[PDB]
């Protein structure tokens, strides 16, 4: 009945008081922010007549509130038109709530129900939405009080107050539906969508809610789809229109309901039509748009600061008033501009811009037509430019585009914007003579910049591993004075992509040389090697005549490349055996390629072992023996220490050429070696490279050292050992040297023992073995001896030979 | 003997032959980078006479060196006057070395030993640095063979090569000292710094390395302290001078050596004398200087890009040539450029500046005196100021300071150097009739800026909690024309130190109104409440008349505050309990306080259990239990709806003014609460608080539920369990209810039990207990029996009682 539009609630229970004469709500109904309520006041506050809220219903921290079940017992619909983010129910933070006691709620037809953060409320999984919502899915039902924590009482089950009622399944629990511990949900058994009674027959399909009457569309409490007259209809009569998705009422009703820009099309009384639909003043039709909706914006003096501030005027196409502009902070501006201003056409009032520091060019008006002027600035001026230090091109709203009825305009101060733009602007304007001198006149516009910019075209290039030379042809400076100089932009850009003018660029001044040989020339240094550069050059052409034509010239940007050089060292080499006789290197590329990559050069050499071993007694002094490679691979002034080093390694270049070092190509980052000898040490020079054949050459070397595995039985020994008695009770026992070791021999372990007896050992070096070709034997107990040798290399223990049998008598 | 200067060899074993007409070495010997080097080439290659290093001695990849022991045979003492970063003895990554092998060398008088990453160089360990250097503490030997992978075997101990030799403890190892296998250190035994000989007698005392004769200064191989003819002094004789603290040359002799910047100040020709000392065309004494050091700087034209190509020119006085300045590029040179220029006081050439849009004063040329300007510029300029942008103070190098002998005066386009500077430096240069117009003309230098700079005082001042509103004297743009606008600089300014014109602050541009009342004003808004803001105020009067005195004029930084407001909502409140009867709450500042913080306003309220848990039966269907807290203290949309609700809370302001709301200040972030009820829930609201008695008022609340712990004893039943017996075997059992549970009973567990066989349980509910006040026992044997009761509250199980016994027959 009653229109009563969207409210929101506030800090007084007496504030609650504006729903007396409210029946359905036209809007949302938000209740919040109630810090000075109790139980009391609200325990005798009740809103009988409430039946249907559009929106949403919002409640947000009402102090006091135990229940709902007095504030709207009558509260059936949630349309859910309109939704607070997506839900149509919202419960937060409320303190004091103990149920949500909706009894007379019949549906939520769109929007998802979020109770949120309710320390105290419980008493909600005992209820099912899917008799409610169309998609209980979408509820958000988290942070409350504990599921298990409070007993969802419902009137049936237990001992509980009465009559029980309906139990239902909503996520496979097939359990009762309850409101409260007095009240629950209304269940009646017919198909869903239908409103029933208190005698449980379910009413007419359009109703919806409840019901007075069975089968009567008259009798519902609130009309399903569509509200006219107190009956319930699936579309409006044909003398009537839509309203809010939800009543009927006739096309001037709806007008006189929104009183000037709403409209009726497609059977909806909206507020304004969507886009391509318009109206100006004939009947409320939102007709088709030709090509375009002439929005139309209304702003007394509209002082524009920044992006965010033109952004207001998005869409307008008729501007009613008049536009200050003022960037000075902003870069580049002239996209987002004309994303927000450019399809304006028509400016009532006056257009002024004034120390647009930001503003390069006046191209973001694209689509104006016409500045009628009818409030313009002071001294009758329409347009007003005044202070722009870099304004250059105006814009292409010219060329008979323009037309400005009354009013003059007003260029001050605009160093870099030339004089014949601003001639052709009035031209084109069709006003010349309004104005006089000291508004246009030149020595605050016009100088600088220039108009009719030539062309400088490179005459030499010289490209060097760091360096670039360049030569331009000579520039006169046409005007005798004209002091120039030239400046070259270079910077380094990968591709063959780049913008002028736009910081990224290195500028460098030039002065030309006072002849008519040697052209001005420049010589850009400390550059890497083999990388792209972008460079072009201007002429600056500052003069200070009345009358002259500038006549700036630059450069098209070319694109040069310096010479390559020797790349860096190979990083993180790991060397691995896998075998007696292979080897297995990988490493990574180097930090700084300076050309393109095309192999590898990998020299390995033989290392001999080191003459120390050799001669010296080995059965004492025991060292640790040195182990095959087995990697794993399936501050200041030390800083400046490696720094200098990385200096003297800078210069090191290597030209693409039991000690032999043999050299190799690889063209991937793994290397792998082959027919090398069993258990002995190699030095491996990794260097990348590139086109050397001509250039300085290959890196430097990253040599590592790595030891191949040994051999299995490199240490037997060949032969049978001999023996040879004497009647001194001494025995020589003689053995054959192995023929390839592990690297070299150490020590020769003789264990001799006699028959019955434990075992003794004994140990000889190399150089007592080689005094007499072997071992002696004294001092012993005649009888029947027997004894074993073994051998002992670099590697390790080697094997047992076969034993000899001796006698002493 | 001979000088043989400090010299570097790489790449060729050809290039080492640069040593066979060397002795002595005054300086540092380097060898590098040897990559075509065989053992073959080393082998048969020997520098005998080499015998003393001064500087320092390096090696760094030299492939195929085994030893040393050929190359320096005789190599004695290493002075280490000048040391590579600290070190006297480098041998860096040194391939097929296998050791040191300088068995001549006497000792190392200053400097470190670094020896590092020689995978195959060993016989390192079995030498001490203590007999050699003064300090072996120092050395960095690291990275090489590991110590006992090789046997460092001397000629001693085992069955070595032949005869032994001394041995030594340097680091608790008392064990042989040898350089290789064959020769080892040669100690004699005698006080340190004493050569000895072949028969072992030590030499002289200032003999060092080695002699020929025992007690024979003349026999020394290599002079200790100084060397002068054959002969070792302690100091150079009369008539001689001291050279590279080696050794002893005449006035003459050491003149020559460095053939004019020489000295020989303090018994030593050096190079160059000292901070301090200076000489110009006397004998060649460095006297001291008067108050700074004349240093004298050559250069033909230095172009000056930037503060690195200035450095060049740090310290020099007489600059000799002429300077051409342009940085384009550059902020705020001045004091780093004052570093570098700024003790030039006469220049030979000219002085230009061309293109220096960072320059805004020359102010770092404060002892600047004369140009002399012998080269000057064509045209017959000597100071050329040409195009910068902004250029206004010109220094303070003026008032007869300068004077220029010869050339004229060329100043053009400097747009923000207002011609009486220019004026000023003509005056006091004393050239005034040498140039004519065209080159201190107008239109080019001189507009735009200002030179007399008057003041604006702020008339009124009105500050809110987010807006501030200025209001400063008209300021008429005297001359009639003279378009003007005012823009204020505004910043965030903590503190009540700030600099002006310097990005940082805020531009905001504002016209002034055409009348003669309502001065111009501003009114600056979105800013944060309580927060001071540094303001000022500049004029631009920007004019194009030809003879108008600019007289720009600004404001004073003048600091204002805006008003406070209320603060934020406590983040991270955790609340606990320590007992029955008290609770304890923390929390953090708010993340905005906007003000000066004062306290926090603490509310608390006794919430009482839901009517839920008090109509129901518990002996089916039982709950979770509440527990006392126990909190150990000793995503777009979801986003989107947090900020959606702060902003409803930004307006939520408190008026610091079984339901009672308790409240109390607490001045820290924490809080205890005393006098409350055992194991019932309480709500805290927590709101911080500053100067709120004229303010908008406190935060919002930022609740938490906290339980009490329970009571110990609190479930016992008061009184003693009474029976009354029936003639139909039934019994009724009555007990009190305790007077103050847990917040509520929930049900009665009765213990029964006939005397002999087990015992039941039965439970009872407490709407069954108070409908006959107590619980019923029928249908059971005739006997004597006895029960015992128990309570059950919300905290848990309650205590047993006294049993009753009864009879039934």
Same mark, same amino acid.
């Given at each position: 009945?009653?229109?009563?539009?969207?409210?929101?609630?506030?800090?007084?229970?007496?504030?609650?008081?504006?729903?007396?004469?409210?029946?359905?709500?036209?809007?949302?109904?938000?209740?919040?922010?109630?810090?000075?309520?109790?139980?009391?006041?609200?325990?005798?506050?009740?809103?009988?007549?409430?039946?249907?809220?559009?929106?949403?219903?919002?409640?947000?921290?009402?102090?006091?509130?135990?229940?709902?079940?007095?504030?709207?017992?009558?509260?059936?619909?949630?349309?859910?038109?309109?939704?607070?983010?997506?839900?149509?129910?919202?419960?937060?933070?409320?303190?004091?709530?103990?149920?949500?006691?909706?009894?007379?709620?019949?549906?939520?037809?769109?929007?998802?129900?979020?109770?949120?953060?309710?320390?105290?409320?419980?008493?909600?999984?005992?209820?099912?939405?899917?008799?409610?919502?169309?998609?209980?899915?979408?509820?958000?039902?988290?942070?409350?009080?504990?599921?298990?924590?409070?007993?969802?009482?419902?009137?049936?089950?237990?001992?509980?107050?009465?009559?029980?009622?309906?139990?239902?399944?909503?996520?496979?629990?097939?359990?009762?539906?309850?409101?409260?511990?007095?009240?629950?949900?209304?269940?009646?058994?017919?198909?869903?969508?239908?409103?029933?009674?208190?005698?449980?027959?379910?009413?007419?399909?359009?109703?919806?809610?409840?019901?007075?009457?069975?089968?009567?569309?008259?009798?519902?409490?609130?009309?399903?789809?569509?509200?006219?007259?107190?009956?319930?209809?699936?579309?409006?009569?044909?003398?009537?229109?839509?309203?809010?998705?939800?009543?009927?009422?006739?096309?001037?009703?709806?007008?006189?309901?929104?009183?000037?820009?709403?409209?009726?099309?497609?059977?909806?009384?909206?507020?304004?039509?969507?886009?391509?639909?318009?109206?100006?003043?004939?009947?409320?039709?939102?007709?088709?748009?030709?090509?375009?909706?002439?929005?139309?914006?209304?702003?007394?003096?509209?002082?524009?600061?920044?992006?965010?501030?033109?952004?207001?005027?998005?869409?307008?196409?008729?501007?009613?008033?008049?536009?200050?502009?003022?960037?000075?902070?902003?870069?580049?501006?002239?996209?987002?501009?004309?994303?927000?201003?450019?399809?304006?056409?028509?400016?009532?009032?006056?257009?002024?811009?004034?120390?647009?520091?930001?503003?390069?060019?006046?191209?973001?008006?694209?689509?104006?037509?016409?500045?009628?002027?009818?409030?313009?600035?002071?001294?009758?001026?329409?347009?007003?430019?005044?202070?722009?230090?870099?304004?250059?091109?105006?814009?292409?709203?010219?060329?008979?585009?323009?037309?400005?009825?009354?009013?003059?305009?007003?260029?001050?101060?605009?160093?870099?914007?030339?004089?014949?733009?601003?001639?052709?602007?009035?031209?084109?304007?069709?006003?010349?003579?309004?104005?006089?001198?000291?508004?246009?006149?030149?020595?605050?516009?016009?100088?600088?910049?220039?108009?009719?910019?030539?062309?400088?075209?490179?005459?030499?290039?010289?490209?060097?591993?760091?360096?670039?030379?360049?030569?331009?042809?000579?520039?006169?400076?046409?005007?005798?004075?004209?002091?120039?100089?030239?400046?070259?932009?270079?910077?380094?850009?990968?591709?063959?992509?780049?913008?002028?003018?736009?910081?990224?660029?290195?500028?460098?001044?030039?002065?030309?040389?006072?002849?008519?040989?040697?052209?001005?020339?420049?010589?850009?240094?400390?550059?890497?090697?083999?990388?792209?550069?972008?460079?072009?050059?201007?002429?600056?052409?500052?003069?200070?005549?009345?009358?002259?034509?500038?006549?700036?010239?630059?450069?098209?940007?070319?694109?040069?490349?310096?010479?390559?050089?020797?790349?860096?060292?190979?990083?993180?080499?790991?060397?691995?055996?896998?075998?007696?006789?292979?080897? =297995?290197? /990988? &490493?990574?590329? #180097?930090?700084?390629? %300076? +050309?393109?990559?095309?192999? *590898?050069?990998?020299?390995?050499? @033989? !290392?001999?072992?080191?003459?120390?071993?050799?001669?010296?007694?080995?059965?004492?002094?025991?060292?640790?023996?040195?182990?095959?490679?087995?990697?794993?691979?399936?501050?200041?002034?030390?800083?400046?220490?490696?720094?200098?080093?990385?200096?003297?390694?800078?210069?090191?270049?290597?030209?693409?050429?039991?000690?032999?070092?043999?050299?190799?190509?690889?063209?991937?980052?793994?290397?792998?070696?082959?027919?090398?000898?069993?258990?002995?040490?190699?030095?491996?020079?990794?260097?990348?490279?590139?086109?050397?054949?001509?250039?300085?050459?290959?890196?430097?070397?990253?040599?590592?050292?790595?030891?191949?595995?040994?051999?299995?039985?490199?240490?037997?020994?060949?032969?049978?050992?001999?023996?040879?008695?004497?009647?001194?009770?001494?025995? =020589?026992? /003689? &053995?054959?040297? #192995?023929?390839?070791? %592990? +690297?070299?021999?150490?020590? *020769?372990?003789?264990?001799?023992? @006699? !028959?019955?007896?434990?075992?003794?050992?004994?140990?000889?070096?190399?150089?007592?073995?080689?005094?007499?070709?072997?071992?002696?034997?004294?001092?012993?107990?005649?009888?029947?001896?027997?004894?074993?040798?073994?051998?002992?290399?670099?590697?390790?223990?080697?094997?047992?030979?076969?034993?000899?049998?001796?006698?002493?008598?």
């Amino acid at each position: 009945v009653e229109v009563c539009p969207s409210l929101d609630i506030r800090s007084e229970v007496a504030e609650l008081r504006q729903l007396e004469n409210c029946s359905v709500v036209e809007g949302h109904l938000q209740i919040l922010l109630m810090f000075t309520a109790t139980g009391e006041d609200f325990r005798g506050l009740s809103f009988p007549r409430l039946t249907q809220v559009t929106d949403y219903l919002l409640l947000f921290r009402v102090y006091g509130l135990e229940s709902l079940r007095d504030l709207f017992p009558n509260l059936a619909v949630i349309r859910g038109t309109r939704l607070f983010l997506g839900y149509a129910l919202v419960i937060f933070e409320m303190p004091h709530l103990r149920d949500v006691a909706l009894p007379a709620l019949g549906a939520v037809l769109r929007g998802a129900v979020r109770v949120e953060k309710n320390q105290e409320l419980c008493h909600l999984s005992t209820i099912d939405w899917g008799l409610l919502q169309p998609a209980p899915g979408a509820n958000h039902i988290v942070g409350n009080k504990l599921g298990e924590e409070c007993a969802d009482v419902c009137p049936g089950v237990l001992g509980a107050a009465g009559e029980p009622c309906a139990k239902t399944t909503f996520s496979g629990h097939t359990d009762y539906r309850c409101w409260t511990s007095s009240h629950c949900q209304r269940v009646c058994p017919c198909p869903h969508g239908m409103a029933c009674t208190a005698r449980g027959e379910c009413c007419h399909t359009e109703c919806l809610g409840g019901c007075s009457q069975p089968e009567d569309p008259r009798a519902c409490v609130a009309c399903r789809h569509l509200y006219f007259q107190g009956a319930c209809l699936w579309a409006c009569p044909p003398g009537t229109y839509q309203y809010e998705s939800w009543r009927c009422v006739t096309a001037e009703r709806c007008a006189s309901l929104h009183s000037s820009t709403f409209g009726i099309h497609q059977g909806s009384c909206l507020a304004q039509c969507p886009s391509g639909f318009t109206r100006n003043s004939s009947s409320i039709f939102c007709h088709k748009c030709e090509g375009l909706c002439p929005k139309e914006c209304k702003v007394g003096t509209k002082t524009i600061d920044s992006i965010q501030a033109a952004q207001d005027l998005v869409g307008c196409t008729h501007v009613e008033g008049s536009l200050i502009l003022n960037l000075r902070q902003g870069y580049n501006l002239e996209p987002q501009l004309q994303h927000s201003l450019g399809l304006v056409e028509t400016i009532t009032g006056f257009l002024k811009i004034k120390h647009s520091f930001a503003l390069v060019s006046l191209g973001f008006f694209k689509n104006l037509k016409l500045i009628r002027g009818d409030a313009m600035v002071d001294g009758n001026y329409t347009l007003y430019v005044l202070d722009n230090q870099n304004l250059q091109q105006l814009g292409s709203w010219v060329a008979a585009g323009l037309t400005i009825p009354v009013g003059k305009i007003y260029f001050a101060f605009n160093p870099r914007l030339c004089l014949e733009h601003i001639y052709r602007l009035e031209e084109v304007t069709g006003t010349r003579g309004r104005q006089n001198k000291a508004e246009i006149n030149p020595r605050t516009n016009g100088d600088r910049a220039a108009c009719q910019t030539r062309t400088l075209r490179f005459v030499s290039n010289v490209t060097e591993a760091d360096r670039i030379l360049l030569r331009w042809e000579r520039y006169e400076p046409l005007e005798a004075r004209d002091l120039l100089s030239f400046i070259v932009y270079y910077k380094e850009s990968p591709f063959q992509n780049a913008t002028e003018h736009v910081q990224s660029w290195n500028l460098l001044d030039v002065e030309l040389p006072l002849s008519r040989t040697q052209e001005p020339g420049v010589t850009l240094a400390s550059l890497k090697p083999w990388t792209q550069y972008a460079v072009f050059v201007r002429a600056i052409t500052l003069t200070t005549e009345e009358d002259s034509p500038h006549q700036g010239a630059q450069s098209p940007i070319v694109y040069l490349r310096t010479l390559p050089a020797a790349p860096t060292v190979p990083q993180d080499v790991i060397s691995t055996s896998n075998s007696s006789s292979h080897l =297995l290197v /990988r &490493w990574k590329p #180097p930090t700084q390629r %300076n +050309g393109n990559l095309t192999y *590898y050069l990998v020299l390995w050499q @033989r !290392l001999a072992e080191d003459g120390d071993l050799y001669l010296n007694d080995y059965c004492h002094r025991g060292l640790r023996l040195p182990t095959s490679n087995n990697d794993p691979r399936f501050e200041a002034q030390e800083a400046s220490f490696q720094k200098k080093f990385e200096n003297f390694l800078h210069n090191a270049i290597t030209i693409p050429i039991d000690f032999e070092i043999q050299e190799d190509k690889v063209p991937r980052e793994r290397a792998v070696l082959s027919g090398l000898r069993h258990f002995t040490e190699y030095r491996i020079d990794i260097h990348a490279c590139n086109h050397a054949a001509h250039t300085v050459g290959c890196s430097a070397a990253t040599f590592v050292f790595a030891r191949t595995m040994p051999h299995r039985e490199a240490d037997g020994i060949p032969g049978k050992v001999a023996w040879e008695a004497s009647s001194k009770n001494s025995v =020589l026992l /003689r &053995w054959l040297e #192995p023929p390839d070791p %592990n +690297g070299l021999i150490l020590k *020769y372990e003789i264990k001799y023992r @006699r !028959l019955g007896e434990e075992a003794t050992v004994l140990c000889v070096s190399r150089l007592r073995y080689a005094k007499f070709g072997g071992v002696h034997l004294a001092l012993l107990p005649p009888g029947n001896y027997s004894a074993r040798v073994r051998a002992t290399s670099l590697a390790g223990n080697g094997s047992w030979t076969d034993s000899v049998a001796f006698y002493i008598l």
